Amino acid sequence: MNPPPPETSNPNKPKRQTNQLQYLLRVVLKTLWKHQFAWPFQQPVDAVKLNLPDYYKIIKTPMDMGTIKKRLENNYYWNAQECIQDFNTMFTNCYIYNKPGDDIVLMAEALEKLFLQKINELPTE
């Protein structure tokens, strides 16, 4: 069973645009998206499709790059750090749901290193 995907809009929450958030969409996300290991992370885990009936029994704060992309596109975030926390939740979720050395974990580890490389330096505001 799949819960609804994480919100990508919320009228109670204030919106913002910053140079750093623009960069997170235009450079960081859009480059990671093209990586050969990006595909498992491009949309919410579909537990019915993937036959992972325990996925949402284990993972209570799901996150994926599709959701992050839509959040950036909709100016959902207040700042870069908020967006960065979503990437970090995505990676951590993968390590939590799986086991060290798993192929899916190797993919997340590779993406995380590339992500860290790209956010090491952000534009100034």
48 touches ligand 1A4 (CB under 6 A): no
57 touches ligand 1A4 (CB under 6 A): no
Burial 51-70 (b: 16+ CB within 10 A, else e): ebeebbeebeebbbbbbbbe
116 touches ligand 1A4 (CB under 6 A): no
In this complex, which beta carbon is closest to ligand 1A4, that of residue 20 or of residue 89?
A: 89
Work out how close the CB of 49 gets to ligand 1A4 at its nearest, in angstroms, rounded to a whole number.
8
Phi, psi of 45 (to 5 degrees): -55, 120
d(CA 21, CA 83): 8
Work out how close the CB of 1 gets to ligand 1A4 at its nearest, in angstroms, rounded to a whole number.
16
**How many Cβ atoms from other residues are within 10 Å of residue 95's Cβ?**
15
As given in the structure block, the two tokens for residue 65 are 């790059």
Number of residues engaging ligand 1A4 in binding (CB under 6 A): 10
- Considering only residues 65, 94, 111, 119, which one is a binding residue for ligand 1A4 as defined by CB under 6 A? 94
